[PDB]
């Protein structure tokens, strides 16, 4: 339905970006994790390889050390994060499906960065409330990546603006939702796509008016909105 | 005379319009919006950095805590003003452009923003300025951040100077690396002869940058394509 679409004007340009600039810079275990995942039935949930390099560039430019990832799946962006962080970096990875994670776990292990990862098999919302209860100022995160159930993004935001340090970054994936967010009405979507589509329009509008953060909506992948905490 | 000026890399004008009106304009500094609306009246307004790309550059600058930057290709100063507003109050920018009169169009808005003091505008071709910067720069003065948005067929020449003028871990950004999507094909019909030279140089630069061990890169399909390079050694 929506997964067949690109935000760029042609698949030729997207493949040009992937082949010229993405794959030649892809870590060998990241390539292996993607190629196994591509044969999985839910391979459409995979974060694009060009977005992945953009994620690690942010992580290194901002010198992130402690990050949280919501929505792991087979672990492409998680492995991308663990490779970008220094060897003493630490990641809190939350996903409901442990089996999805164990698909990519051997490649995280072969990369030697499993020690940076604390995987939590849970729904994300209770974990964040739990983290709110037992965290103080020097446990705050530098970086957060939200890539899970779309209709819960606004709930994650209310908790992540407190679990991320001042000056830290929160990133929301699929904010352009295959272009469908550009219109108030959109024909012929299945109810789950329409729920997510309406949730992103409210989220994009809300985040543009949120005095707690600066934002930057980036037209990469399916849309990523970078949020930097102000206070 | 340039044919690709109005071509979008996104799939529809409405999607770009949505991004600008939802996420770009509501977060645009009033003097940045003032400068853009004046520039869009000007002849070569096509050279203006898109507003959604402006907030991306600003976001990069604050996250990486840049304090000393260099800007190659100023025009009326949209990305320059974007940089000056993002940098700390004691920040420093070296801005280079052949055209001083273009800069003076946006200089009133840079002044009303209170950030002119951070800017050292140099009216010159960039290559001679970079070559003399190489002579008199100690490793304490290396720039954190370089934005290249000038003559496209010179990007590779600038690259050899900027890998030495930017600190290790610093960022070098190349604008227009997608050239309106025309880089996706070996040949592209009906371009200005100057347009084609730029199209061929970006294809060479994109392949070269992907194999350059001195930097890690990420090509971002925002605006007309931005390639962030991070110096490794
Ligand atoms: N409520 C919830 N709590 C935690 N994880 C959830 C969740 N709802 C959905 N998810 C998970 O979020 C994932 C989204 S796909 C994420 C892709 C991954 N970031 C990559 O790099 O490819 C799915 O694996 C799903 O199991
Ligand atoms: N060789 C050269 N050295 C320095 N500047 C040059 C140059 N060749 C072209 N330029 C300048 O580079 C500019 C490119 S347009 C740059 C737009 C600007 N960065 C913005 O934010 O809108 C033009 O103004 C042109 O005068
Ligand atoms: Ca489970
Ligand atoms: Ca996603
Ligand atoms: Ca001149
Ligand atoms: Ca440009």
Author numbering:
A (entry chain B): 9 to 239
B (entry chain A): 7 to 239
Quote the study on this structure:
Amaryllidaceae alkaloids, such as the Alzheimer’s medication galantamine, are complex plant secondary metabolites with recognized therapeutic value. 4′-O-methylnorbelladine (4NB) is the branchpoint intermediate for the entire amaryllidaceae alkaloid (AA) family, and therefore was the target compound for biosensor generation. Since norbelladine 4′-O-methyltransferase (Nb4OMT) from the wild daffodil Narcissus sp. aff. pseudonarcissus, is directly responsible for 4NB production from norbelladine, we chose this as a starting point for development of a fuller pathway. Furthermore, LC/MS analysis identified 3’-O-Methylnorbelladine as a minor component, indicating that the wild-type Nb4OMT enzyme was not highly regiospecific.
To better understand the mechanism underlying the three beneficial substitutions in the Nb4OMTE36P/G40E/A53M variant, we determined the structure of the Nb4OMTE36P/G40E/A53M variant in complex with S-adenosyl-L-homocysteine (SAH) at 2.4 Å resolution. The Nb4OMT variant exists as a homodimer in the crystalline form, consistent with its size exclusion chromatogram. The overall fold of the protein was almost identical to the predicted AlphaFold2 structure, except for the N-terminal region. AlphaFold2 predicts that Lys13 forms tight salt bridge interaction with Asp155, Asp181, and Asn182 in the enzyme active site, while the experimental structure showed that Asp155, Asp181, and Asn182 instead coordinate a Ca2+ ion and Lys13 forms hydrogen bonds with the backbone of Tyr186 and the sidechain of Tyr194. The experimental structure of Nb4OMTE36P/G40E/A53M provides a basis for the improved thermostability of the enzyme (an increase in Tm from 52.8 °C to 58.4 °C). The A53M substitution inserts a larger hydrophobic methionine inside the hydrophobic pocket formed by Trp50, Tyr81, and Tyr108, stabilizing the active site of Nb4OMT. The E36P-G40E double mutant shifts a glutamate from position 36 to position 40 and thereby preserves the salt bridge interaction with Lys118 while proline capping the alpha helix. To better determine how the A53M substitution affects the substrate recognition of Nb4OMT, GNINA 1.0 was used to dock norbelladine into the crystal structure of Nb4OMTE36P/G40E/A53M with SAH and Ca2+ already in the active site (based on Fo-Fc electron densities). In the docked structure, the Ca2+ ion positions the catechol moiety of the substrate adjacent to the SAH binding site. A sulfur-π interaction between the catechol group of norbelladine and Methionine 53 may also restrict the rotation of the catechol group, thereby reducing the cross-methylation of the 3’ position and improving specificity.
